[model samples]
Target: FTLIELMIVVAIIGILAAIAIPQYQNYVARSEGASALASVNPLKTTVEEALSRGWSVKSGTGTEDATKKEVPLGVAADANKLGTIALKPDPADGTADITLTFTMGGAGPKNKGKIITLTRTAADGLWKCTSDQDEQFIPKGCSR
Candidate 1:
């Protein structure tokens, strides 16, 4: 091909790459987020099983007397489950809340941290999964 034709082709390729790169990055981010979310299922099951077996699970170190504590079956028991799969809460946020962050290869983009926060609430008496965006994605009404 002539030089002009070759230059035109290169320009087109560069344009395509520019467009595709960001889209590809976005796909990766979304995929990582979804994968992180998927990890919660097993953990949730483990927590439920532990609770069902009469294990008292909670966010922090201190635990109340089992006899006086009210434990709910299924969804109601979630809030008491502790520890974020691989991530921990900031020390400064002591008593703030515990979170579970799933990271692909242990890290990813800023917006794609692949983190999920699990929080406990006295109102619901279950551990709920929340995304980085502060949106709840787990517990399914606190059952199972």
Candidate 2:
């Protein structure tokens, strides 16, 4: 092709790359956040179920069976579960709460540094979920 044609093609490719690269990155980030949320959804349901019947494994120190491991939301049971999971029993009168860490450490955007927390209230007995990743790409109802 002539030089002009080649230059035109290069310009087009550059423009496309500029647009496509960012879109691709956004998609990736959304999926990372979504996957993180979805993977733990069952745990939320499981915890809600147990909470309804005065069931709380808040005091478990990793010694309970799979069932009792609710202390840490039992997420550690999952092969894909990563980072740190912390559980705290309600202060003698509140619903138990748990927080999850998405990253192991170091640099790079793994969407793992944000904290997803679920806290139950004594008034409702049901649980509510929240997250620190307040970006628009994250799952809905994951904020205050």
Candidate 3:
């Protein structure tokens, strides 16, 4: 190949890398955020079932014993995914709210320490999903 042809190909690849790398990072951030949200979804049901069975629950990080009738919610142990999960029961309204904090290993710049929160209402037992991530990185069915 001619010297100029090789130079032009290198330039194109460089530009492509600049664009593709950021796009890949964003995708990773979004998928990780969604996974974190999914991890929190089922815990809402567990909390509801516990409440219905007349089990008393307290503020815990899924590591509490049955003394409070709180079951282990199973936390994620990965370094690049879920950081911690916490469940806090509201005494005034008898509702349990769950919050999930995420830790991004490779995509931390775009994610910015995202958090997914589920707030339950005692009146109707509805769990609302919210997040601290940007709109583009927020998981489906969740709002900022």
Candidate 4:
């Protein structure tokens, strides 16, 4: 009786773990997305500050060098099961419309397109993530 009950309990526990793991991974994916986007927040502020202090996007191309910073995770930024996280422009260019890119899914940045794009307009001229990511994924401050 004890052996049978223990086996049943073990089987039930295994089933529960199977259900829980993927759910946990999804939750972790969502939170990691927040981390990935938030990691680029400093760069966003840097662009705004630089532009306010007189910087240029150079023919509307999102290219500039506003550095004096480093990524938080630095090297491990992309080392996870959630997938690789990266800035669209490497060496960061040091600057965007700076973007947060996910290289996890085949739908990721290099594979897909820029998931989060932060830009500053010449008219209103305020820097913000004016683009929307998938409503199912992270929404980097744009509308769903």
Candidate 5:
């Protein structure tokens, strides 16, 4: 009887672990992605205002460099738990007025190096978020 009860406990623990693993991963993905989103979303207004004022904003790779101009952002370089960010003008589509990119670094092993992208269209000045992470792991509102 003792041996049988021990086996049952082990089996239950295994089941719990299986459920917990995925739940933990989901939690990590949501929190990390959300932090990145919160960090960049507010910058949309700053970028738009800078463009209107003819500041000739330049691109940056989220690093402090003499050559990279981040004046348009109106904020200094920054880094978050997920990773560093980059801001560039005229993204590959050749239509977006600007692009904000966040590359995962401190994220979990499964999510490291993933990308979150935010693009602003020149015509409407609306910002959209996108990501390279799996659909389940992607941040809210980052799919489109």
Candidate 6:
């Protein structure tokens, strides 16, 4: 009877662990997404700083237009312009309203094209991101 009880206990614990682990992972993912979204403010600041110092801040990864590319990972330097701050998304999942992206040559996460659109307010002025209420700024491919 003791052996049977021990086995049952172990089995129950294993079941509980299995149930809890995935939920924990989802929670972590959501937290990361929120953090990534929050990063937009700093990124906007960086762009504004660059602009103030007579540097043109352009935001884009590839040849895709603003509507085509759902997630932009990085920015590049145009001729006679300073290089962009790269903001690549995390590799775990590709479709989220906000995602973790690598920046500064894969140094860490960057919040680019995740929650807000990086755009210029005025030429040679400070660059800014769109507010959260601007649904048009959301990426096209992002769902849920």
List RMSD in Å for every model shown.
Answer: 9.4, 4.5, 3.7, 7.7, 4.7, 13.2
Better of 2 and 3 by lDDT: 3
What lDDT tens digits, residue by residue, belong to model 6 across residues 51-76? 34443333455542343323333444
Better-scoring candidate (lDDT), 1 or 3: 3
Off by over 4 Å in 1: 57-105, 111-114, 133-144
lDDT of 1 at 8: 97
**lDDT: which is higher, 4 or 5?**
5
lDDT score, residue 68, model 4?
35
What digit string (tens of lDDT, one per residue) describes model 3 on residues 1-144? 899999999999999999999898988877778877776676666666667777644444456455655554454445234455555543112543443333443346666556778777666777778887788888888897
User: Candidate 4: worst 10 consecutive residues by lDDT?
Assistant: 56-65
Candidate 6: segments with Cα more than 4 A from true spot: 48-55, 58-144
Candidate ordering by TM-score (highest first): 3, 5, 2, 1, 4, 6
As for candidate 3, its clashing pairs are: none
Residue 121, candidate 5: alpha-carbon lDDT: 81
TM-score of each: 0.55, 0.66, 0.75, 0.52, 0.74, 0.38
For model 2, where is the 10-residue window of minimal lDDT?
Answer: 99-108
Q: Give the top-scoring candidate (lDDT).
A: 5
**Winner by lDDT between candidate 4 and candidate 3:** 3
> Which candidate model has the greater TM-score, 1 or 2?
2
User: Candidate 4's residue-wise lDDT over 1-144, tens digit each?
Assistant: 699999999999999999998787666555655654564555555444544655432212243445633222233454444445554444332233344544444333322343455544445646555334456556446543
lDDT for model 2 comes to: 0.55
lDDT of each: 0.46, 0.55, 0.63, 0.49, 0.69, 0.39
Q: Cα RMSD for candidate 6?
A: 13.2
